[PDB]
Coordinates of C-alpha atoms and ligand atoms in Angstrom, one line a residue:
Chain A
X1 CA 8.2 -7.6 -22.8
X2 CA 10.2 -9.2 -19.7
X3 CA 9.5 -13.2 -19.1
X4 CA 12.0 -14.1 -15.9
X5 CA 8.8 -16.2 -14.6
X6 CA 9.0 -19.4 -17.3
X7 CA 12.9 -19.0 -16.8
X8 CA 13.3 -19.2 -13.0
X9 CA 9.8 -22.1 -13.6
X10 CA 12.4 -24.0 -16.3
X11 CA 15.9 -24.0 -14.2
X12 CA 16.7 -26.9 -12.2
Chain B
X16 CA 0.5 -37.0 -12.9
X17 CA -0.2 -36.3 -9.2
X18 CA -1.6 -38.1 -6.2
X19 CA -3.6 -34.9 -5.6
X20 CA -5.4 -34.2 -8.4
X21 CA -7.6 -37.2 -7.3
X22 CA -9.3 -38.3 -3.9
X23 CA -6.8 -38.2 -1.1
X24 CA -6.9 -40.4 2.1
X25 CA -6.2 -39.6 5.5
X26 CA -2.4 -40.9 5.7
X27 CA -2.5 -39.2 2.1
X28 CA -3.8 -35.6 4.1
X29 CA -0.7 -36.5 6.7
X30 CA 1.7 -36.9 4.3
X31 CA 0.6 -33.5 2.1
X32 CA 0.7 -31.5 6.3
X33 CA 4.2 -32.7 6.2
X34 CA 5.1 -31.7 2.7
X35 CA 3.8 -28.1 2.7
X36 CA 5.1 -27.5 5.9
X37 CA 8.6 -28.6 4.8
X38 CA 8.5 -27.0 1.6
X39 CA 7.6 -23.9 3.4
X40 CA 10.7 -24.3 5.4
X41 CA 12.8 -24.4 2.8
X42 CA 11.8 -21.4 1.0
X43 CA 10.4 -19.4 4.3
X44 CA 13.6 -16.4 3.0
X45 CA 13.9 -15.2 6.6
X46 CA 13.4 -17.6 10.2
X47 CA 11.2 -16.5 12.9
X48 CA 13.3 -16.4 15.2
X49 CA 15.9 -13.9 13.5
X50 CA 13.1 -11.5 12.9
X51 CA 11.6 -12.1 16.8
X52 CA 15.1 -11.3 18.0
X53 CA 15.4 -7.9 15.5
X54 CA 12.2 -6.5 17.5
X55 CA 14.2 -4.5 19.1
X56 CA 16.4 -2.9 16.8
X57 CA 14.2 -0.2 15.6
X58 CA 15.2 2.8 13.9
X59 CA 16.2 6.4 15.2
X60 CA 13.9 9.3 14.7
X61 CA 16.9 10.5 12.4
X62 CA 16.8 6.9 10.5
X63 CA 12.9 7.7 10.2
X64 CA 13.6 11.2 8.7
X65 CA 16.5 9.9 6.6
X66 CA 14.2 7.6 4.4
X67 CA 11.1 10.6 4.7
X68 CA 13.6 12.8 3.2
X69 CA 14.4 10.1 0.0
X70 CA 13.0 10.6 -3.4
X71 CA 9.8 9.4 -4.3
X72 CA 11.5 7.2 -6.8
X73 CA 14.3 5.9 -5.0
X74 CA 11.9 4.9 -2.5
X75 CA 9.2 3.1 -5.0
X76 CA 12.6 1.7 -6.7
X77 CA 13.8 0.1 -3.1
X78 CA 10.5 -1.5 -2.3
X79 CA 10.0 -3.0 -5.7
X80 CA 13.7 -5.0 -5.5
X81 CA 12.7 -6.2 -1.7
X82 CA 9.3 -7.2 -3.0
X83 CA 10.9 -9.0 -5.8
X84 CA 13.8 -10.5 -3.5
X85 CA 10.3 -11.9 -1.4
X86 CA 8.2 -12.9 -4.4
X87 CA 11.8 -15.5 -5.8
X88 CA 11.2 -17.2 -2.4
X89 CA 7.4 -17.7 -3.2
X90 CA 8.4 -19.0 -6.7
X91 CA 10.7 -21.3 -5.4
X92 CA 7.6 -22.3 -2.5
X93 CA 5.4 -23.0 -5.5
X94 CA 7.8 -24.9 -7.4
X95 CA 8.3 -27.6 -4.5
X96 CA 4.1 -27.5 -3.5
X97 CA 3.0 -30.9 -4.2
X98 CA 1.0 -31.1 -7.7
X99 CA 2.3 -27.4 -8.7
X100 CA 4.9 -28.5 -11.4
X101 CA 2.7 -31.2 -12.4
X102 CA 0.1 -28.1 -13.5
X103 CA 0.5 -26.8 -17.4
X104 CA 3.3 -23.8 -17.5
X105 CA -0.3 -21.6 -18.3
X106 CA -1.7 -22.4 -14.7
X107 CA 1.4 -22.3 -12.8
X108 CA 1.8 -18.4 -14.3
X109 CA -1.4 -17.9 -14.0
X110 CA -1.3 -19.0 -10.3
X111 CA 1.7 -17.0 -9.8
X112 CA 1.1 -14.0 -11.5
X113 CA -2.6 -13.8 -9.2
X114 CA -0.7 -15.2 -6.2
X115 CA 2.7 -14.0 -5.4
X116 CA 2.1 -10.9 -3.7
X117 CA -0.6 -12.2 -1.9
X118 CA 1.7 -15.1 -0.3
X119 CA 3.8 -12.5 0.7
X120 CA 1.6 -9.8 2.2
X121 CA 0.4 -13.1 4.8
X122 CA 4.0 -13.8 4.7
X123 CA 4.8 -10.3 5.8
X124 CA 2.6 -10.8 9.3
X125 CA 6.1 -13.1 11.0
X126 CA 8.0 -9.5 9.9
X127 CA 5.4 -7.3 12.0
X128 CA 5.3 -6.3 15.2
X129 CA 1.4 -6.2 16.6
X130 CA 2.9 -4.1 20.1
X131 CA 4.2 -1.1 18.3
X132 CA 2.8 -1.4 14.6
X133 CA 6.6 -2.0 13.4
X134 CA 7.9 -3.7 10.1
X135 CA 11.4 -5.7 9.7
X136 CA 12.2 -3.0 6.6
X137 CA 16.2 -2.9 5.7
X138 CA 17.7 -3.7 8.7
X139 CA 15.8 -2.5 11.4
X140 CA 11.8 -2.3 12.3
X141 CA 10.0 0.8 11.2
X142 CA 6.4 2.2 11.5
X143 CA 4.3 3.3 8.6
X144 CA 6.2 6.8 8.7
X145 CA 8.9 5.3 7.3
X146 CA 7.2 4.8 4.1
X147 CA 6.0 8.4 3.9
X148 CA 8.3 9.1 0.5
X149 CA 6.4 7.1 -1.4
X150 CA 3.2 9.0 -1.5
X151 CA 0.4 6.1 -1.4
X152 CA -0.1 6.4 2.5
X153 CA -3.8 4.6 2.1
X154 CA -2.2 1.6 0.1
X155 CA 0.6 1.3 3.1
X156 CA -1.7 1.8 6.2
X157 CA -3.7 -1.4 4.4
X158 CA -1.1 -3.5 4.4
X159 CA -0.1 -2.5 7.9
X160 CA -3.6 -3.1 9.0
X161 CA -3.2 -6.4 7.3
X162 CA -0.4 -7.7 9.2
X163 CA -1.8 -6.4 12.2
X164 CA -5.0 -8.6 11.6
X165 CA -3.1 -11.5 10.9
X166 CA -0.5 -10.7 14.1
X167 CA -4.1 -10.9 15.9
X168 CA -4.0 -14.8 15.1
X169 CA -0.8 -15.9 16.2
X170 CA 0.3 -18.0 13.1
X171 CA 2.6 -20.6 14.1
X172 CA 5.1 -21.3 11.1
X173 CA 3.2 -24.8 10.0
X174 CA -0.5 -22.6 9.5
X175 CA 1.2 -20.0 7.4
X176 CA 3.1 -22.5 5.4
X177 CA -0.5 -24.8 4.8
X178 CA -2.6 -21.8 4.4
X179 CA 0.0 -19.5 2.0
X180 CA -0.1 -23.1 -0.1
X181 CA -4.4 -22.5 -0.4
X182 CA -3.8 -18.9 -1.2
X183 CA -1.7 -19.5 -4.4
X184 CA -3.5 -23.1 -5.5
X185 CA -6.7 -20.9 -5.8
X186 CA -9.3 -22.7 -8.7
X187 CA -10.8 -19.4 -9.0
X188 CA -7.6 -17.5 -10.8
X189 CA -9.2 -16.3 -14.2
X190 CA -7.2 -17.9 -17.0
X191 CA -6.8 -21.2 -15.5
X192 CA -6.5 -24.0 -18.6
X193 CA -6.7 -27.1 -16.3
X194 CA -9.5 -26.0 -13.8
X195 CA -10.7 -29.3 -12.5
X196 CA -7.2 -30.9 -11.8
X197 CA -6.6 -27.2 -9.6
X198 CA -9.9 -27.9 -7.8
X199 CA -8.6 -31.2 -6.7
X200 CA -5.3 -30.0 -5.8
X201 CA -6.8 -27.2 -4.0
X202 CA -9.2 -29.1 -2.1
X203 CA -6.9 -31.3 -0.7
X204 CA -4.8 -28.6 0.2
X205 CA -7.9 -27.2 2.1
X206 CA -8.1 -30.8 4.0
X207 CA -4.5 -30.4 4.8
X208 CA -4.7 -27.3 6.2
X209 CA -8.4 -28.2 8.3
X210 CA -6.6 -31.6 9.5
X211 CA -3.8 -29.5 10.7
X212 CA -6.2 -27.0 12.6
X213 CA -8.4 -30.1 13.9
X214 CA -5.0 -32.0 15.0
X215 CA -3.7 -28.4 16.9
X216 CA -7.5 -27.7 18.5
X217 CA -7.4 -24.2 16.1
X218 CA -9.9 -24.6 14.3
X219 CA -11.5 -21.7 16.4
X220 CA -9.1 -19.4 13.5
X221 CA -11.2 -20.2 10.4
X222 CA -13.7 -18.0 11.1
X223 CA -11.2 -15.3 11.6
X224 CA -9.0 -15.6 8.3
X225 CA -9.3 -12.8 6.0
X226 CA -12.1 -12.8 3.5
X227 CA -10.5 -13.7 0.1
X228 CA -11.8 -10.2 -1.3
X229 CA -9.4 -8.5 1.1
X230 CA -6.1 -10.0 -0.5
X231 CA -7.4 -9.0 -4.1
X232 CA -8.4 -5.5 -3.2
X233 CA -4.8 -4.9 -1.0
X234 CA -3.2 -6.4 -4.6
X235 CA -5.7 -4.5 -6.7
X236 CA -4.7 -0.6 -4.7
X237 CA -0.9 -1.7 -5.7
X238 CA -1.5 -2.6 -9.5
X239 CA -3.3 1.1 -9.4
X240 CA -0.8 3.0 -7.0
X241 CA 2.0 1.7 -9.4
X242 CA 0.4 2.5 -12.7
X243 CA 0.0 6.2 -10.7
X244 CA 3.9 6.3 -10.2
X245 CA 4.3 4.8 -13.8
X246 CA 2.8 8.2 -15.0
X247 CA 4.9 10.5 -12.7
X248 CA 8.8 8.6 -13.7
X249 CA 7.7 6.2 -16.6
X250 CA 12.0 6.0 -17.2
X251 CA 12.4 5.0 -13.6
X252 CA 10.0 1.7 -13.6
X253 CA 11.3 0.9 -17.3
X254 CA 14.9 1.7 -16.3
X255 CA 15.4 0.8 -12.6
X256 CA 12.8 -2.0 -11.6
X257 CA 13.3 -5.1 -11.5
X258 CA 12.3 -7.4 -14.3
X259 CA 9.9 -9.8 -12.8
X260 CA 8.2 -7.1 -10.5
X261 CA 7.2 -5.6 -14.8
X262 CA 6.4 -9.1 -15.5
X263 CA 4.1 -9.5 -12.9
X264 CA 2.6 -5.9 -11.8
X265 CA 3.0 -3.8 -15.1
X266 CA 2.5 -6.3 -17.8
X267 CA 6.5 -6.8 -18.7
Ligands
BWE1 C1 8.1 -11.9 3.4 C2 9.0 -13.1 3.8 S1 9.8 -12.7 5.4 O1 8.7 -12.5 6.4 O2 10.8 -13.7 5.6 C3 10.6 -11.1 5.1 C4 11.6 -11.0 4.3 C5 12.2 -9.8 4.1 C6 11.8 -8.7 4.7 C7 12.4 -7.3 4.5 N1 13.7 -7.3 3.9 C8 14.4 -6.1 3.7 C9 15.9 -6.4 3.4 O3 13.9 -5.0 3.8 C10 11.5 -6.6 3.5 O4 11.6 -6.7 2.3 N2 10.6 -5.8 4.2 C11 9.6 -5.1 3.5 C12 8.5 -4.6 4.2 C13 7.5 -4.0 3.3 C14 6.3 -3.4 3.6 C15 5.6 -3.9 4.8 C16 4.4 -3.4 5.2 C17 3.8 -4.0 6.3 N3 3.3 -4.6 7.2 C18 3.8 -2.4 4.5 C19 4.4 -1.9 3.4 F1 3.8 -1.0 2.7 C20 5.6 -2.4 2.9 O5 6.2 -1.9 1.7 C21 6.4 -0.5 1.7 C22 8.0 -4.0 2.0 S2 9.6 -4.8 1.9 C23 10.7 -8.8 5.6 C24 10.1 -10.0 5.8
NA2 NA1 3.4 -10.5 13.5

């Protein structure tokens, strides 16, 4: 149940 | 929301060349030229047999945190792609999740070398042998075959950047929310790239780029070659890989 993929999408 | 989700003109084509290529550039992980001038730093028949002699495991484990190293850099690509972040957070990981690996694998062509079949791998440049451990020798020799396909065309930097930008803005990707507005982006992703090719007299490579079944069957043989080591040291891939390689090749 990993979800890196909307984290590194949402970090500016 | 975007410029290219609609009918682009010609200085609008120009200005999307330009963009791709320097987003490319920006995210490209390793120059050219520092893996033109490794060429020659290839490893020792002793280097070979250290990594033959590796665990399975520790092999699998290695390649998944330098394919997930490779795939951050395609992310960050993606996220400076004209029109991408202007796509629903459904279609941009939908996009990525199909795509990732597959920008990579043409990626991987600037890291091979077509005059002895060698592969910038930790360090140095190594043959399919080096890779041996691992025990999916059919899965590797594609991917080396691969890059020796696309070595055959002699990419320049701006045609990988403008065609790596078509393989990930692909309308096709099942799951897509916003189809229409990734047909227009795509198309005019497809003019960019043709302008470019028309512009550089290379137009000559079209009918030699890979059909797009071969990127999905090279991606499909790794979903399945995982899932076979996923049997043989389930603790390993839950334990020891990275995150995002779960996220995106072994559903989390
Ligand atoms: C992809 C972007 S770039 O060209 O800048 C770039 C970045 C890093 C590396 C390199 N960095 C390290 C530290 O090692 C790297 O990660 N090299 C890998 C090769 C393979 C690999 C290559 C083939 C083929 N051809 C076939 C395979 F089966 C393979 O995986 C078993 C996996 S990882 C190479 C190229
Ligand atoms: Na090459």
């Amino acid at each position: 149940k990993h979800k890196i993929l909307h984290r590194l999408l949402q970090d500016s | 929301e975007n410029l290219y989700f609609q009918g682009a003109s010609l200085t609008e084509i120009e200005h999307l060349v330009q963009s791709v290529c320097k987003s490319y550039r920006e995210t490209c992980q390793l120059r050219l030229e520092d893996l033109l001038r490794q060429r020659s730093n290839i490893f020792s028949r002793e280097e070979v047999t250290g990594y033959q002699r590796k665990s399975m495991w520790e092999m699998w484990e290695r390649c998944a945190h330098h394919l997930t190293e490779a795939i951050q850099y395609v992310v960050e690509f993606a996220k400076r792609l004209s029109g991408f972040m202007e796509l629903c957070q459904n279609d941009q990981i939908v996009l990525l999740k199909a795509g990732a690996m597959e920008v990579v694998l043409v990626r991987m062509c600037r890291a091979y070398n077509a005059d002895n079949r060698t592969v910038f791998f930790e360090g140095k440049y190594g043959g399919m042998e080096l890779f041996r451990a691992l025990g999916c020798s059919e899965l590797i020799s594609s991917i080396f075959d691969f890059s020796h396909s696309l070595s055959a065309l002699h990419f320049s930097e701006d045609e990988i950047a403008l065609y790596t930008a078509l393989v990930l803005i692909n309308a096709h990707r099942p799951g897509l929310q916003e189809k229409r507005k990734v047909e227009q982006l795509q198309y005019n992703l497809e003019l960019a790239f043709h302008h470019h090719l028309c512009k550089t007299h290379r137009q000559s490579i079209l009918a030699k780029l890979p059909p797009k079944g071969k990127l999905r069957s090279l991606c499909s043989q790794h979903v399945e070659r995982l899932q076979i080591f996923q049997h043989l040291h389930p603790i390993v891939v839950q334990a020891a890989f990275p995150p995002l390689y779960k996220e995106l090749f072994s559903g989390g």
